[PDB]
PDB file of C-alpha atoms in Angstrom:
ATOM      1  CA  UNK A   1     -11.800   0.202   3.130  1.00  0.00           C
ATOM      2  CA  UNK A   2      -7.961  -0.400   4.344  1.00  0.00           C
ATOM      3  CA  UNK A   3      -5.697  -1.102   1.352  1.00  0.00           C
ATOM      4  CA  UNK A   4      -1.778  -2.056   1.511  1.00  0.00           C
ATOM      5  CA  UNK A   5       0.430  -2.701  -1.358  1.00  0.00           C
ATOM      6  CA  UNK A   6       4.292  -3.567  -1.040  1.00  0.00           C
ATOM      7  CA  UNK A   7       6.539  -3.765  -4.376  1.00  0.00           C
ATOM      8  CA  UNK A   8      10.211  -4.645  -3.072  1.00  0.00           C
TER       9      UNK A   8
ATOM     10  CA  UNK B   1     -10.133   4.572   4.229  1.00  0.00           C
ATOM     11  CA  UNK B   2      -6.990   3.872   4.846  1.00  0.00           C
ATOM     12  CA  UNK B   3      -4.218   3.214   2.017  1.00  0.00           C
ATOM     13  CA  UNK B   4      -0.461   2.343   1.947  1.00  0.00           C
ATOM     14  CA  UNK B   5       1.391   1.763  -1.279  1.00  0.00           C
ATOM     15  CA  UNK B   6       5.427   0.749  -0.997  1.00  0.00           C
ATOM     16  CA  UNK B   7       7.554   0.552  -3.815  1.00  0.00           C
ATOM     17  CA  UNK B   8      11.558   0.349  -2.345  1.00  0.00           C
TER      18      UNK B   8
END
């Protein structure tokens, strides 16, 4: 499982 | 598993 979360 | 969380 490859997870990838940006807030910007 | 591989996770990445930004927040900048």
């Amino acid at each position: 499982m490859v997870g990838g979360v940006v807030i910007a």
